Scaffold this active site. Structure first.
Site, PDB file in Angstrom:
ATOM      1  N   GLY A  59       4.545   0.432   3.097  1.00 46.39           N
ATOM      2  CA  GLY A  59       5.084  -0.587   3.975  1.00 46.39           C
ATOM      3  C   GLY A  59       4.803  -1.995   3.496  1.00 46.39           C
ATOM      4  N   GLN A  60       4.458  -2.132   2.219  1.00 52.34           N
ATOM      5  CA  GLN A  60       4.180  -3.442   1.653  1.00 52.34           C
ATOM      6  C   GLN A  60       5.463  -4.260   1.551  1.00 52.34           C
ATOM      7  N   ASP A  61       5.294  -5.583   1.483  1.00 53.75           N
ATOM      8  CA  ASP A  61       6.448  -6.469   1.363  1.00 53.75           C
ATOM      9  C   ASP A  61       7.222  -6.194   0.081  1.00 53.75           C
ATOM     10  N   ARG A 100       8.593  -2.574   0.808  1.00 52.15           N
ATOM     11  CA  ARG A 100       9.543  -2.378   1.900  1.00 52.15           C
ATOM     12  C   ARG A 100      10.983  -2.310   1.415  1.00 52.15           C
TER      13      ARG A 100
END
Ligand SMILES: Nc1nc2c(ncn2[C@@H]2O[C@H](COP(=O)(O)OP(=O)(O)OP(=O)(O)O)[C@@H](O)[C@H]2O)c(=O)[nH]1
Ligand SMILES: [Mg+2]
Lengths: 142, 570, 18, 415, 10, 198, 180
Positions: free
Chosen positions: G69-71, G74
C-alpha cells in the site's frame, strides 16, 4: 569502469551486448550503430584504440566477430586488452573451440559467464580456474 | 586454374573453347580480373560460332582499355567481320567498333564506317549511326574529317523510320555536344517529314522524334498549329516518357502560341487528362511527373486548376512521392479547396514521419500565409496541433504561430492567451525564439508577460545569440510598453547582456539599448516599438528567364534537381 | 467456368451505325 | 543519358552490368551502397542517386536494385522507360526475379543487354522480337522490326483465331476517417489475349460517351473515361481524327486501352469500423460491412483488412459471416470472405487484451482496405459495341472477353 | 563461412 | 514451447530484412499470447526468445511483467532468466525495476549461493538511486561475511552503491576495516577496489 | 471433440481459481498471507516489491499475489490486476486517518473496466484492538453497499488471532464456485 562491452561481427551483426551505463534504448541503439560504423570503417593499423565521446573505445577482434569496450580515461589501456583476452580464454575453455555459430546458440551461457566474470564494469574474478569452477557448479545446479 | 584455362583456350576443341569462354565470363562477371588472359583469347577470336563472337567482343571491349597495346591484334578481325553477310554479325561488329576506347583503334575503322554508312538494313543503318556517334564523341575531329555529317543529315530523309530516328538522335547528340556552330536545323519540310514518320516511329523512335522538335523555334502560328495538332495524338501513348516528351514539346510550342486562338484552350484542356494519367504512373516515374508538373505549374497554372483530389498523398506513396504531392498541393493551393487542403494537412499531420510532419506543418503555414481567407482556420488548426501534445508538433505550431503573427498580427491578439500557457518548457531554439518574439511584439494581451520572461531570463547569457537577442528585444519592448512592471527587468537584461554577454553583436545591441534607455525613454517607444511595414515574403516561383530555359529542358536530370542544365553537369 | 466474369462473344462493329 | 545500366543485389554485389557509353568508371557502383545506406538512415534516399558529378539512378527490383549510372543531364524519363522495358523483358524471358536466374542465364542475358541499347540509346524493345533474335536455348534479325508494323509479327499461323479479352475494373475509394470519400477514381483496363493466324488489324468499338455524342447516340449509358491511353499497336491518328481505334493486335496478351476517370457513384462496399479500445485494458472491433453493390453481383474472395493493435494479443472475434484470421506478420485482422453477395451485411465484434506496459512510441493509423473482387459486373456501364477483325486472307474470328471488377485503392482512413 | 573458426585458434 | 536454438535457426534462415522482421513479429506475438495465459512451464524458452528479439533490435515493452513474475519464481533456471531479463531490459529509467526491490530483498536472504550472487550482480549492474537506498543495509551486512566467493560480489555491490549514492559511503567505513589479509586474489582485489573508490 | 479427460480431472478436483492481495501498507497483508499459506504470523519488512504465493484449499489452488500500500506501490496494482481472478482488500480499522485514503484507493481501483469480473473481497484487518470497527461500520464508511454489480462480503479477521480466515475462504469459494 567499462561503460559498455558488446560483441559484434565483421558484417555488423552483434553477437554480444552488455552496457553498464543506463542509457535510453534509442540512444543505446544509436551509440551501438556509431561504434559499429567506426569499427567497420577502421583499418588494421589503427592501434585498436579509439577515443570516441571521451570513452576508451578499444576494438580488438581475434576472429570475424570483433570485440569492443568503452571505459573512462582513468586506467591503463593495456589492462582492458588483458581483461578481454582473459575473458576470451575463459569463454573458450568453458565452451571448447568457440565459433561464431556456437556464440548465437549459447547466448544465455555467454551472458551468465560475463556476469559471473565482470559486474558493473569492474573486474570480479581475477583467477581463471575459480571462475570456471563456479560457472560449472552453477550449470550443474539446474 | 589460370594455366588450365589458358591451355583449354589454346586447344582446337570447339566445346572446350566454349566452356573456357563461359568460365572466363563467369569469372569476369563474378569479379575476376581476366584482362591478363586477353592476349591469349586474341588468337581464339575468328570463330564461326555467333555466341563465341559475342563473348569475344565483350571481353575485348572490357579488356580494351586495360590492354590498349594488346588490342592492336583485332583490327584485321573487325575488318573481316565488317563484310559479314549476316546483319546481326554486322550490327555486333559495328557496336564493338564504337565500344572500343582506343585512340589508335578508331583510326583504322574509318573505312568500315564509311562502307557501313550506306547499309541497306535498317538495323544496320542504326548500328552505323550509333558507331558514327560513338566515334564523334570519342573523336569529334576524327568524325569531322570522316565527313559523316552529310551522311547523317541525309539519313533522316530515308526509309527505316527507326533508323531515321536513331540517326536523328545521333545528330542531336553531335549538335548537343557541338558548340552550336554548324547546327543541323531543318526547314519546315524536314519537320513535316519527321511528323509523317512520327506515327510510324516506335516508342524509342517517338522520343527521338520529339527531341528534335525541342530545338527548333517555330515562327508561324499556322506552323505552330500544325505542330500542336500532330503532337496531340502523342498524348494517347502508353509510353510515359513519350507522354513527357509530348508535354514538353507542347509547352515549348505554347510559348509562341496566341491566347486569342482556340488552339491554346484545346491544348490546355487535353493536357489535364494527360497529367492525371501521368500522376498514376510508377513510383520511380511519380517523382519525375511531380517535378515536371512543378516546372510547368509556374508556366500555365490555370491548366491544373481543377486537379486537386489527385494531389493528395497516397498511404502507400513513398516519402519522396509524399513530399512531391505536398509541394504540388502547396503550389496548387486555392481558396476553392481550402477546406480540403486543411483536412489533408490535418490528415498528413497524423503520420509517423517526423520529417513528413514538419513538411506538412510548413505547408500548412505557407498556405495560411498565402491566403488570408483561411487565417482563422489556420489558427484553429495550429491550436489543435499544439493541444495534440507533440513535442515536434508543438514546435511546428509555435513556429507557424510566430510566422502568422508577423504576417497577419492584426487579428492575432486572441491567441496570445491560448499560446501563453502552451507547455513553454520546450528548449528548441526555433520555438523558443519565436515564442519570445511573439511575447515581445504581442506584450499587450498578456498580463503576465514579465512573469513568463522571468523563467527565460535565468540562462539568457548562455541560451543562444539569436535567442539572447530575441529575449533582449522582448524585454526592451515590454519596458517601452509597460515599464512599471519591467523597470528592474530592463536594467537586469541590460546588465546581463552588457557585462555578462561577450557576444560582439549581442554586446553592441545591449549597449545600444542601454544608450537609448538612458537618452530618451519616450523616444524609445517611437524608435524601438515602431509600426513595421508589411513583411515582403520571398516568392517561391522561379525566375521567368530560368522558367523559359527550364521549359525546353524537359525530362532532363536538371528538371528533377530544379537546377540549370549547366549548373548540374560536370 | 472462370472467376472474374465469363468470357463472352464480341461483335465486329456497331450494326446500328451503318 | 545513363552511362551504364547494371543489375545489383541486396548485399551490394552487382548481379550484372553492361556499359553503354564508358564515360563513368565501373568502380562507382561500390560507393552506391554506402550512399543508399546513408540516405535510408537519414531519410534522404531517392531512386535517382548522385555520386558527385555522376548520377546513379537506381530502382528497387524484386531482389536487386537496377542501378543506372549517368554522367550528363540525359533524359531521366527515357532512362526510367528503358529500365521498365528491361524489367518487363527480363520478366518475360525469366519467370523468376531473383539472383537464381541472374547467374543462370548470363550467356543470353549479355546478348539481350547488348541488343537492347547501344551508346545509351535503346534500340530493341519488343520482347517477342528479342526472343525471335536472342534465345537462351543466331539467324538474321527479323524484318518486322525493320518494317513499320513492329506490334504484329507477320506469318503467324494458328489452327483457330481466338482472342481472350479482359474487362478489368479497378475501384479505388479514398474514404477519410470523417466518413467522406475524397479520392474516388475508377481505372479501366482493356486487355485482350489475341491468338489468331496472321496480323489482323483490330477495329475497336465500344459504347463511349464521346463516340455516342459524335454519332448522335449520346442518349444511352456511355462511358466517359477521363483518361484513355492507347496501346503501342493502336493507331493514334484514327483516334484523334474520329476516335477510330484501328491497330494491329499483338501476338498474345496485351493492354490495348485503359480507361481512367473519376467516379461519382456510391461505394460498392460500405464498411463501418468501431475502435472500442480500452486504456491498456481491452480492445473493441465494431466492424460492420454493408454491400452497396447490386444483389445480383457476388464479391469472390473478399478480404477486408482491419489493422489490429501492434502489441495486441489474445484477441477474440465475434463475427457473423466470413472467417476472421489475425496474421502476426500483418499485425492486423483480415475479414476474409469466400463469396460476398451484393447487399450482404456483415457485423464483427473483436475483443482482445493489451499489455500492461505502455508503448514507448506511437505506431500510426494505417488505412483500412478491402480486397473484394466481384467479376461479371460492369459498374461503369460501358458496353463494347464491336471489334473489327479484318484479315487480308479472310477468316471468321470468335473473340471472347470477360468483365472483372476488383477493389483497387479502396482504403478507408482509420479513426 | 568464417564463423565456425575458433576465435583464438587454440 | 519454441526453443531458443530453433528461433536462432529460423532467424538465420531468413534473408530479407522484411522477412526477418515478420518472423520476429510472429515470434513476439506468440510469446505475448503465451504470457497472457500465465504460462509457467516453457517460460524459459519464451524468455530466451524475447531476449534474442530484444538483442536483435525488437521491442520488448510488453515482455516486462513476465520477467518480473519469473524473478519471484522458485526454479533456478527461472530465477536466472528473470535476473537476465532485469539486467538487460530493466533499467532505472525504465521504472519497471521498482517492483523488483521486494524480490531482491527476499532473495537477499536466500540460502543458495548462486541465487544470492546472481541477485547481487543484477543489483550492481542495474543500480538505481532509490534501489540502493532501500538495499544499502543489505549490502553492508554481506560485506562482513567470510565467503570468498561472496566477498567480491559484496565489494562490487558496495562500490556500485557508492558510485550511485556518494552520500552512502559513510556506512562502509568500518565494514572494510581489517580486510587487507585476504588470501584469495578476488577478495583482496575487491577490497582494494572498494578502498580506491572510497 | 471429447471432454472425458476434463470430466475425469474434475471428478477428483481440477478447479484452482485465482486471488489477489490488496490493501494499505502495515495492514496485515504479509501477515495475512503468511497465516493463510503457513498458519503463523511471521514478521515481514515493508512490501517494497510484491509477494507471490499459492494456497491450496478444498482442492482449489488459489494463488495469492500480495500488493503493498505504499505510495510508490499503490499505482503498481494495475500491473498485478492482469491475469488475476480474485482480489482481497486489507483494511485497517484502527487507522482512522488512513481509512479515507484506503477508501479512495478502493474506489479508484474499483472504477477500472478491466477490474470488473472480480468479486469484492474486503477483510477487516487489525481486528484485535478496541479501535477496530465492526463488519458494518467499516463497510458503511467505505460505501461497500454502493458498489453496483459487485459481490462484496465483509469479514473481520485478527492478524494475531487469524479467526475468520476460514469463513472468508468459504465465502470466496461459494461466490466464485457455482457447483456442488
Ligand atoms: N501484531 C499485529 N499486527 C497487525 C494486526 N493487524 C494488522 N497488523 C499489521 O500488519 C503488519 C504486518 O506486516 P507485513 O507482514 O509486512 O504485511 P503488511 O501489513 O501488508 O505490511 P507491508 O508488507 O509493509 O505492506 C504489522 O506491521 C501490523 O501493523 C494484529 O492484529 N496484530
Ligand atoms: Mg506485507
Amino acid at each position: 569502469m567499462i561503460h559498455f562491452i558488446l560483441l559484434f561481427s565483421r558484417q555488423g551483426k552483434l553477437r554480444l551486448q552488455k552496457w553498464y551505463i543506463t542509457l535510453p534504448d534509442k540512444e543505446r541503439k544509436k551509440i551501438t550503430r556509431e561504434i559499429v560504423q567506426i569499427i567497420l570503417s577502421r583499418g588494421h593499423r589503427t592501434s585498436s584504440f579509439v577515443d570516441w565521446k571521451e570513452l576508451k573505445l578499444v576494438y580488438k577482434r581475434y576472429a570475424s566477430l570483433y570485440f569492443c569496450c568503452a571505459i573512462e580515461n582513468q586506467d591503463n589501456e593495456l589492462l582492458t586488452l588483458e581483461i578481454v583476452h582473459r575473458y576470451v580464454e575463459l569463454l573458450d575453455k568453458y565452451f571448447g573451440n568457440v565459433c561464431e555459430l556456437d556464440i548465437i546458440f549459447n547466448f544465455e551461457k555467454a551472458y551468465f559467464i560475463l556476469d559471473e566474470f565482470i559486474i558493473g564494469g569492474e573486474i570480479q574474478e581475477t583467477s581463471k580456474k575459480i571462475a570456471v569452477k563456479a560457472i560449472e557448479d552453477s550449470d550443474m545446479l539446474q | 586454374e589460370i594455366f588450365e584455362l589458358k591451355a583449354e583456350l589454346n586447344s582446337d576443341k570447339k566445346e572446350k573453347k566454349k566452356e573456357a569462354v563461359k568460365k572466363v565470363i563467369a569469372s569476369m562477371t563474378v569479379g575476376k580480373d581476366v584482362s591478363a588472359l586477353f592476349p591469349d583469347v586474341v588468337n581464339c577470336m575468328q570463330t564461326d560460332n555467333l555466341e563465341l563472337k559475342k563473348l569475344v567482343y565483350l571481353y575485348l571491349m572490357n579488356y580494351a582499355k586495360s590492354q590498349p597495346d594488346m588490342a592492336i591484334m583485332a583490327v584485321n578481325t573487325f575488318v573481316k567481320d565488317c563484310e559479314d553477310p549476316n546483319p546481326l554479325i554486322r550490327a555486333l561488329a559495328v557496336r564493338t567498333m564504337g565500344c572500343i576506347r582506343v585512340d589508335k583503334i578508331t583510326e583504322y575503322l574509318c573505312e568500315p564506317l564509311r562502307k557501313c554508312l550506306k547499309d541497306e538494313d535498317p538495323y544496320v543503318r542504326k548500328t552505323a549511326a550509333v558507331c558514327v556517334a560513338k566515334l564523334h564523341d570519342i573523336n569529334a575531329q576524327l568524325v569531322e574529317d570522316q565527313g559523316f555529317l552529310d551522311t547523317l543529315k541525309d539519313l533522316i530523309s530515308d526509309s527505316n523510320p527507326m533508323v531515321v530516328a536513331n540517326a536523328v538522335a545521333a545528330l542531336s547528340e553531335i549538335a548537343e555536344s557541338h558548340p552550336s556552330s554548324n547546327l543541323l536545323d531543318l526547314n519546315p519540310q524536314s519537320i513535316n517529314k519527321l511528323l509523317t514518320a512520327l506515327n510510324e516511329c516506335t516508342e524509342w523512335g517517338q522520343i527521338f522524334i520529339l527531341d528534335c522538335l525541342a530545338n527548333y523555334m517555330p515562327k508561324d502560328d499556322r506552323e505552330a498549329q500544325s505542330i500542336c495538332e500532330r503532337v496531340t495524338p502523342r498524348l494517347s501513348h502508353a509510353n510515359s516518357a513519350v507522354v513527357l516528351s509530348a508535354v514538353k514539346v507542347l509547352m515549348k510550342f505554347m510559348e509562341m502560341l496566341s491566347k486569342d486562338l482556340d488552339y491554346y484552350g484545346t491544348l490546355l484542356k487535353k493536357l489535364a487528362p494527360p497529367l492525371v494519367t501521368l500522376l498514376s504512373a510508377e513510383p520511380e516515374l511519380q517523382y519525375v511527373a511531380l517535378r515536371n508538373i512543378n516546372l510547368i505549374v509556374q508556366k500555365r497554372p490555370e491548366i491544373l486548376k481543377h486537379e486537386m483530389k489527385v494531389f493528395f498523398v497516397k498511404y502507400n506513396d513513398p516519402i519522396y512521392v509524399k513530399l512531391e504531392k505536398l509541394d504540388i498541393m502547396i503550389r496548387l493551393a486555392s481558396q476553392a479547396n481550402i477546406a480540403q487542403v486543411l483536412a489533408e494537412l490535418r490528415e498528413y499531420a497524423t503520420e509517423v514521419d517526423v520529417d513528413f510532419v514538419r513538411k506538412a506543418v510548413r505547408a500548412i503555414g505557407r498556405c495560411a500565409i498565402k491566403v488570408e481567407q483561411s487565417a482563422e482556420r489556420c489558427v484553429s488548426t495550429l491550436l489543435d496541433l499544439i493541444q495534440t501534445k507533440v513535442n515536434y508538433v508543438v514546435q511546428e505550431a509555435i513556429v507557424v504561430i510566430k510566422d502568422i503573427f508577423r504576417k497577419y498580427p492584426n487579428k492575432y491578439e486572441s491567441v496570445i492567451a491560448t499560446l501563453c500557457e502552451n507547455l513553454d518548457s520546450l528548449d528548441e531554439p526555433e520555438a523558443r525564439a519565436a515564442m519570445i518574439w511573439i511575447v515581445g511584439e504581442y506584450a499587450e494581451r498578456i498580463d503576465n508577460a514579465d512573469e513568463l520572461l522571468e523563467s527565460f531570463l535565468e540562462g539568457f547569457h548562455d541560451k543562444s545569440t539569436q535567442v539572447q537577442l530575441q529575449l533582449l528585444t522582448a524585454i526592451v519592448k515590454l519596458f517601452l510598453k509597460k515599464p512599471t512592471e519591467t523597470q528592474e527587468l530592463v536594467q537586469q537584461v541590460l546588465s546581463l547582456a552588457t557585462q555578462d554577454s561577450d557576444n560582439p553583436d549581442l554586446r553592441d545591441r545591449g549597449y545600444i539599448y542601454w544608450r537609448l534607455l538612458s537618452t530618451d525613454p519616450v523616444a524609445a517607444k517611437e524608435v524601438v516599438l515602431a509600426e513595421k511595414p508589411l513583411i515582403s515574403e520571398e516568392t517561391d516561383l522561379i525566375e521567368p528567364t530560368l522558367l523559359d530555359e527550364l521549359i525546353c529542358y524537359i525530362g532532363t536530370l536538371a528538371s528533377v534537381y530544379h537546377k540549370p542544365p549547366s549548373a548540374f553537369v560536370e | 467456368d472462370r472467376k472474374g466474369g465469363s468470357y463472352s462473344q464480341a461483335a465486329g462493329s456497331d450494326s446500328a451505325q451503318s | 543519358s545513363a552511362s551504364a545500366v547494371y543489375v545489383l543485389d541486396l548485399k551490394g554485389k552487382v548481379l550484372i552490368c553492361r556499359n553503354y557509353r564508358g564515360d563513368v568508371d565501373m568502380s562507382e557502383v561500390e560507393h552506391f551502397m554506402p550512399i543508399l545506406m546513408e540516405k535510408e538512415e537519414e531519410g534522404m534516399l531517392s531512386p535517382i542517386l548522385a555520386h558527385g558529378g555522376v548520377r546513379f539512378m537506381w530502382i528497387k527490383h524484386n531482389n536487386l536494385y537496377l542501378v543506372a549510372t549517368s554522367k550528363k543531364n540525359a533524359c531521366v524519363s527515357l532512362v526510367f522507360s528503358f529500365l521498365y522495358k528491361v524489367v518487363q523483358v527480363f520478366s518475360e524471358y525469366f519467370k523468376e526475379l531473383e539472383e537464381e536466374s541472374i547467374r543462370d542465364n548470363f550467356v543470353i542475358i549479355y546478348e539481350l543487354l547488348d541488343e537492347l541499347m547501344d551508346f545509351g540509346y535503346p534500340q530493341t524493345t519488343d520482347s517477342k522480337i528479342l526472343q525471335e533474335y536472342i534465345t537462351q536455348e543466331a539467324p538474321r534479325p527479323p524484318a518486322t522490326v525493320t518494317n513499320a508494323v513492329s506490334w504484329r509479327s507477320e506469318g503467324i499461323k494458328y489452327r483457330k483465331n481466338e482472342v481472350f479479352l479482359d474487362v478489368i475494373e479497378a475501384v479505388n475509394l479514398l474514404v477519410s476517417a470523417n466518413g467522406n470519400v475524397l479520392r474516388s477514381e475508377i481505372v479501366g483496363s482493356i486487355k485482350m489475349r489475341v491468338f489468331l493466324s496472321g496480323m489482323p488489324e483490330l477495329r475497336l468499338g465500344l459504347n463511349d460517351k464521346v463516340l455516342f455524342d459524335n454519332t448522335g447516340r449520346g442518349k444511352s449509358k456511355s462511358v466517359e473515361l477521363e483518361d484513355v491511353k492507347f496501346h503501342q499497336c493502336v493507331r493514334l491518328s484514327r483516334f484523334e481524327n474520329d476516335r477510330t481505334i484501328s491497330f494491329i493486335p499483338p501476338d498474345g496478351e496485351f493492354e490495348l486501352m485503359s480507361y481512367r476517370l473519376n467516379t461519382h457513384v456510391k461505394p460498392l462496399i460500405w464498411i463501418e469500423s468501431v475502435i472500442e479500445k480500452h486504456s491498456h485494458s481491452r480492445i473493441e472491433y465494431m466492424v460492420k460491412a454493408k454491400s452497396q453493390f447490386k444483389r445480383r453481383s457476388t464479391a469472390n474472395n473478399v478480404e477486408i483488412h482491419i489493422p489490429v493493435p501492434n502489441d495486441a494479443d489474445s484477441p477474440k472475434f465475434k463475427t457473423t459471416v466470413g472467417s476472421v484470421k489475425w496474421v502476426p506478420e500483418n499485425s492486423e485482422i483480415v475479414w476474409s470472405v469466400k463469396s460476398f453477395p451484393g447487399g450482404k451485411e456483415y457485423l464483427m465484434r473483436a475483443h482482445f487484451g493489451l499489455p500492461s506496459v505502455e508503448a514507448e512510441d506511437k505506431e500510426g493509423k494505417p488505412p483500412i482496405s478491402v480486397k473484394f473482387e466481384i467479376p461479371y459486373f460492369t459498374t461503369s456501364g460501358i458496353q463494347v459495341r464491336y471489334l473489327k477483325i479484318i484479315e487480308k486472307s479472310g477468316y471468321q474470328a470468335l473473340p471472347w472477353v470477360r468483365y472483372i471488377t476488383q477493389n483497387g485503392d479502396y482504403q478507408l482512413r482509420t479513426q | 563461412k568464417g564463423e565456425n573458426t575458433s576465435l583464438l585458434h587454440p | 514451447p519454441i526453443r531458443l536454438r530453433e528461433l536462432i535457426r529460423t532467424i538465420r534462415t531468413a534473408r530479407t530484412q522484411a522477412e526477418e522482421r515478420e518472423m520476429i513479429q510472429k515470434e513476439c506475438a506468440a510469446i505475448r499470447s503465451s504470457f497472457r495465459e500465465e504460462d509457467n512451464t516453457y517460460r524459459c524458452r519464451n524468455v530466451a526468445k524475447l531476449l534474442y528479439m530484444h538483442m536483435l533490435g525488437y521491442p520488448a515493452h510488453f515482455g516486462q511483467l513476465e520477467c518480473l513474475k519469473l524473478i519471484a519464481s522458485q526454479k533456478f533456471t527461472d530465477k536466472r532468466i528473470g535476473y537476465l531479463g532485469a539486467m538487460l531490459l530493466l533499467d532505472e529509467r525504465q521504472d519497471v525495476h521498482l517492483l523488483m526491490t521486494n524480490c531482491i530483498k527476499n532473495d537477499l536472504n536466500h540460502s543458495t549461493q548462486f541465487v544470492q550472487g546472481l541477485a547481487l550482480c543484477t543489483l550492481g549492474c542495474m543500480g538505481s538511486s532509490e534501489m540502493c537506498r532501500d538495499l544499502a543495509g543489505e549490502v553492508e551486512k554481506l560485506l562482513k561475511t567470510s565467503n570468498s566467493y561472496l566477498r567480491k560480489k559484496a565489494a562490487l555491490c558496495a562500490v556500485h552503491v557508492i558510485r550511485k549514492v556518494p552520500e552512502l559511503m559513510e556506512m562502509f567505513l568500518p565494514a572494510t576495516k581489517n580486510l587487507l589479509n585476504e588470501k584469495n586474489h578476488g577478495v583482496l582485489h575487491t577490497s582494494v577496489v572498494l578502498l580506491t573508490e572510497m | 471433440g471429447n471432454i472425458f479427460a476434463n470430466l475425469f480431472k474434475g471428478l477428483f478436483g481440477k478447479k484452482e481459481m485465482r486471488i489477489l492481495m490488496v490493501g494499505l501498507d502495515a495492514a496485515g497483508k504479509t501477515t495475512i498471507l503468511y497465516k493463510l499459506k503457513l498458519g503463523e504470523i511471521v514478521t515481514t519488512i515493508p512490501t517494497i516489491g510484491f509477494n507471490v504465493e499459492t494456497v491450496e484449499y478444498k482442492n482449489i489452488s488459489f494463488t495469492v499475489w500480495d500488493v503493498g500500500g505504499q505510495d510508490k506501490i499503490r499505482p503498481l496494482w494495475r500491473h498485478y490486476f492482469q491475469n488475476t481472478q480474485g482480489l482481497i482488500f486489507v483494511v485497517d480499522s484502527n487507522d482512522r486517518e488512513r481509512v479515507n485514503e484506503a477508501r479512495e484507493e478502493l474506489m479508484r481501483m474499483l472504477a477500472e473496466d478491466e477490474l470488473r469480473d472480480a468479486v469484492l473481497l474486503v477483510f477487516a484487518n487489525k481486528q484485535d484492538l478496541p479501535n477496530a470497527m465492526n463488519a458494518a461500520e467499516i463497510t458503511d464508511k467505505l460505501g461497500l453497499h454502493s458498489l453496483r454489480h459487485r459481490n462484496w462480503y465483509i469479514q473481520a479477521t485478527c492478524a494475531t488471532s487469524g479467526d475468520g480466515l476460514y469463513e472468508g475462504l468459504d465465502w470466496l469459494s461459494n461466490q466464485l464456485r457455482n457447483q456442488k
